[PDB]
Design a protein around this ligand. Structure first.
Ligand SMILES: NC(=O)c1ccc[n+]([C@@H]2O[C@H](COP(=O)([O-])OP(=O)(O)OC[C@H]3O[C@@H](n4cnc5c(N)ncnc54)[C@H](O)[C@@H]3O)[C@@H](O)[C@H]2O)c1
Ligand SMILES: NC(=O)c1ccc[n+]([C@@H]2O[C@H](COP(=O)([O-])OP(=O)(O)OC[C@H]3O[C@@H](n4cnc5c(N)ncnc54)[C@H](O)[C@@H]3O)[C@@H](O)[C@H]2O)c1
Ligand SMILES: NC(=O)c1ccc[n+]([C@@H]2O[C@H](COP(=O)([O-])OP(=O)(O)OC[C@H]3O[C@@H](n4cnc5c(N)ncnc54)[C@H](O)[C@@H]3O)[C@@H](O)[C@H]2O)c1
Ligand SMILES: NC(=O)c1ccc[n+]([C@@H]2O[C@H](COP(=O)([O-])OP(=O)(O)OC[C@H]3O[C@@H](n4cnc5c(N)ncnc54)[C@H](O)[C@@H]3O)[C@@H](O)[C@H]2O)c1
Ligand SMILES: O=C(Nc1cccc(Br)c1)[C@H]1CC(=O)N(C2CCCCC2)C1
Ligand SMILES: O=C(Nc1cccc(Br)c1)[C@H]1CC(=O)N(C2CCCCC2)C1
Ligand SMILES: O=C(Nc1cccc(Br)c1)[C@H]1CC(=O)N(C2CCCCC2)C1
Ligand SMILES: O=C(Nc1cccc(Br)c1)[C@H]1CC(=O)N(C2CCCCC2)C1
Lengths: 268, 268, 268, 268
């Protein structure tokens, strides 16, 4: 009876209880969705974290840089949700950039191997996951990825900005493919969320100046947002992802929905 | 139990059974909303049309060019929904441009009096309506207006394009005001919908070349849209408006959601 | 031998020696252009100001709200530059909004008559001037208007933002008409320039909060701009307008060039 | 006495006489610039081609994937233009994507190694070249790269679209670095130019459907462009690059100038 009643949804990207994907998973389950989860590398940790979700959900291993994992993924999902069943939704909440590509390390000093790894995980993998899963998605389905608005440059975000610009472009091409299946593809551009790592960066993990810059970004964000922005609360973001996973945005694809308090619409 | 259960929503803009606002009203009522309707000039016609909606809804007169109508509107709404009750939602589905400002009449030949009238009704009135109704809206509420993507020029749409560009700008300022009330303001940029008037234009009501241009626009739209576009079906648009009226896009304001099949994301 | 050698260019919008148009006129003359000037209302003042330009230029009266002035304009220009000669360039540097539509007066309290007047002068008149002058422009010619980036809302600029959004839309339609003549149409989106009026607003002419907001805008602008921004210097803006008036941007029309230090490309 | 009189400009990207960079080089020399050229792999061919330029220019080898080439580049340039002299301009006209990432090969079938190579050459190298050359650029200098508008998806261009989206993002960060040197960074988004390779693709080199799609793109481009578009003529593009290399766009950085006939401003 919830927003997502009866829907089978794959959620990637949980690593801590502060992960945006954890909150996406929690809200989707509150709204009646049946989930399959995917996790990278630390599956014991991730199972222990996801035990706290309101309902049980199978956890599958997925390193998006691993071709074998991607080749087997649809079969492993079908095993978890049962033969003859398909997915209605896929959430990509995956991002990574080596520390040379973010923070106080100069923009020009990031080696391309590092940048390439970040773009692989943060942008190309959105296509990789759609390739793997569209064959087991139902018409009317929905693929959602997470974005951080890269239309303008900003301090420290550096090559991760570039990776997000690439992701936005990938999403428009994934929509062309997904459309053949009756499936939508979209991104949610979220405001800053104080995940574990972000608090670590604010605390200086990538250099003092980067931490200072993020605090400034956060303060400015809430100021600009006409309805404000609470960086400690991922729930408005998770709700937005569930809106796109639902039946209520049926004519939106290849697009970007901004769950950012309206900040990007305001100069000051 | 629907998406809009318990919500009180004002819907403007119904004039025929093919009006986008009629379909918005129908879907909102299907999803549990309690409506108040507003109508321009032809209230007997509009009552007869809206008798076909699934539930009863009070019809109020509102000419957005009439200062008296706007000054009395909140009191008349409060009378209709009962003292102590406020609105959760407001739908602006109002547009007009004199024939000198659209169609085959040359762009340069539209007198400013005509253009000004079109901008008054199509853009300024979004601010007028927000001014009148924000004092009787609840926190968490939502103001939605209808848009037709004006970021690029196109044949025949002419000064109505300009009016929509102005509307998009107005919406960003209305978000700043609405935010003070805990209310969101957004537009839905819809693909072409074959309303009575559009079929009239396709049939040559504003000149043969304009009709030909709209048919080309419509065909191109469905081609570009990765999930296609059915100009005869307003329901995907109405669903999108209901999504914004709901609780499920709580961090989106001053913004534009595209219910256009994804066409604007694709060149060809 | 200058950039604009041999070119005949009409420059509107001079009212003080700090007007952007004064600096446009000065630079164009330095670069070899032969000018015709147009002025509103205070022609004695404007002649006295423009006596300080490096070369003589005929001054013609043009109130863009006056239909007679617009109807006679091409004939008066042809008289000034000589029969058989046409214009190569037209600069629109005209803007106005009543004080109810800018400053600390609330957004919702601007009467539409005031907003309409501002849109007439600031947006519709770009079309009016193109209508009047395209019949006496040479192929390869260039129409340039002044813009202040309205893609996001901001404090106090209010309905002038809306007028600029409308102008951007008008410019795209003027390009369609101008193209028939082999003429380009573009806008220059300038950073903040401390004209007489702006210093007056900073000094509180439209309310204290508006003045404070502009100082904040100015400071933020220079901070964001990767090459900085000097609000006291209009010359980089004037140079950009001359670039568009020249032969060196032959494939750019309906477009917006940002002479803003790069500020709009940067979040922080 | 030309537009670029006295300026020392590095031009990369010549491989045939139809290369956009050849035409950029030709026009810059016509306008008084003194050039240094860089070439990839086929230096005998490139010397023979560039012998046809109006003036002599040293050719240097530069594979942007080669760290040694980049590390030595500034020293080799300084050798060619003489100690104590610096560059005023740098043109990046470099792009590549393996055939798996463009054409009729499905979007999902491009291996990441191929995509990474394309992004390395087409996007990261803009940063690589700026890193190498900013230490030998004069204040007031200008870095220009070539772009093909990737804001919307389109048939066949596929991962090259993604690479261009990344480039646009890189350019905004390169502007932040370049600004420290008093140097601007910008892209020129060109309309389609019928280079050797493009004619090869139109002739079916990357599959019949891709060729058909490009012909459609080309036809639509000229139709939309308000001043038209001649895919056989690179000169308007080269002129635009020279405008950015000149002193006449001094307040534009991190930005994109569209030398596309105005096509991107028009829907139809
Ligand atoms: N935190 C914010 O402020 C913010 C804002 C907007 C968007 N986003 C985006 O939201 C998404 C989730 O980020 P988050 O803030 O929740 O951080 P997070 O660290 O909780 O999530 C990132 C996830 O990426 C996964 N990942 C990394 N490498 C992987 C690989 N090889 N294979 C599979 N998964 C891999 C990690 O295991 C982790 O689960 C990312 O796309 C991020 O860019 C974050
Ligand atoms: N039809 C499409 O293709 C399309 C596409 C995108 C957006 N839109 C927009 O959707 C909205 C509804 O348009 P529609 O196609 O349903 O047409 P419609 O003719 O059914 O609706 C337009 C409404 O505006 C009302 N109106 C006109 N002058 C008014 C005034 N003075 N005061 C109050 N109301 C007034 C009319 O009475 C009518 O109800 C408009 O904003 C239109 O621009 C339409
Ligand atoms: N000053 C800035 O910060 C800034 C920034 C970006 C863009 N702009 C724009 O540049 C242009 C010039 O502005 P400015 O700052 O030089 O101010 P200004 O006051 O010097 O110029 C505005 C001009 O508009 C003219 N004008 C007003 N009503 C008119 C009418 N009825 N007919 C004809 N002309 C009329 C005035 O006489 C004046 O010459 C305007 O379009 C303005 O919006 C200004
Ligand atoms: N042709 C068009 O329609 C078009 C349109 C817009 C933009 N562009 C862009 O203009 C630029 C030039 O393209 P073009 O059409 O003139 O094609 P071109 O083939 O003539 O130029 C591409 C150049 O990239 C060089 N290159 C490839 N790999 C390299 C490497 N490892 N190191 C150094 N250089 C390398 C090639 O040697 C060649 O000189 C590219 O950025 C292209 O994306 C082209
Ligand atoms: O890093 C972030 N913001 C951030 C913003 C500005 C500067 C810097 Br340094 C960082 C947020 C946005 C984002 O994509 N994140 C990712 C970064 C890679 C690992 C997963 C989380 C976290
Ligand atoms: O007119 C429309 N499309 C349209 C598109 C292209 C050219 C021309 Br002429 C028309 C649609 C979009 C739009 O705002 N409409 C309005 C026009 C004013 C009266 C209410 C409906 C109808
Ligand atoms: O007003 C301006 N900036 C400005 C910016 C922010 C808030 C406020 Br209040 C003002 C500048 C930009 C602009 O279009 N101007 C116009 C305003 C109308 C009269 C001519 C000059 C001056
Ligand atoms: O490829 C092009 N257009 C193009 C457009 C649409 C589909 C396809 Br397939 C191709 C043009 C634009 C562009 O970046 N080019 C590059 C491609 C890589 C090698 C150098 C030239 C050529």
């Amino acid at each position: 009876t919830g927003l997502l009643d009866g829907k089978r949804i794959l959620v990637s990207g949980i690593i801590t209880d502060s992960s945006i994907a954890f909150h996406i998973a929690r809200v989707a389950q509150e709204q009646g969705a049946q989930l399959v989860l995917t996790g990278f590398d630390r599956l014991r940790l991730i199972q222990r974290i996801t035990d706290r979700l309101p309902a049980k959900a199978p956890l599958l291993e997925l390193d998006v840089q691993n071709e074998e994992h991607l080749a087997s993924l649809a079969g492993r999902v079908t095993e978890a949700i049962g033969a003859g069943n398909k997915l209605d939704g896929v959430v990509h909440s995956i991002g990574f950039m080596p520390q040379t590509g973010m923070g106080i390390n100069p923009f020009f000093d990031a080696p391309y191997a590092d940048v390439s790894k970040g773009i692989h995980i943060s942008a190309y993998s959105y296509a990789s996951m759609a390739k793997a899963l569209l064959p087991i998605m139902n018409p009317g389905g929905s693929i959602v990825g997470m974005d951080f608005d890269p239309s303008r440059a900003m301090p420290a975000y550096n090559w991760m900005t570039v990776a997000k610009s690439a992701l936005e472009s990938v999403n428009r091409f994934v929509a062309r493919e997904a459309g053949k299946y009756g499936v939508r593809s979209n991104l949610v551009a979220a405001g800053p969320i104080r995940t574990l790592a972000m608090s670590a960066i604010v605390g200086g993990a990538l250099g003092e100046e980067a931490g200072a810059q993020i605090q400034l970004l956060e303060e400015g964000w809430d100021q600009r947002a006409p309805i404000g922005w609470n960086m400690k609360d991922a729930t408005p973001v998770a709700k937005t992802v569930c809106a796109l996973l639902s039946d209520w945005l049926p004519a939106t694809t290849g697009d970007i929905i901004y769950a950012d308090g309206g900040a990007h619409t305001q100069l000051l």
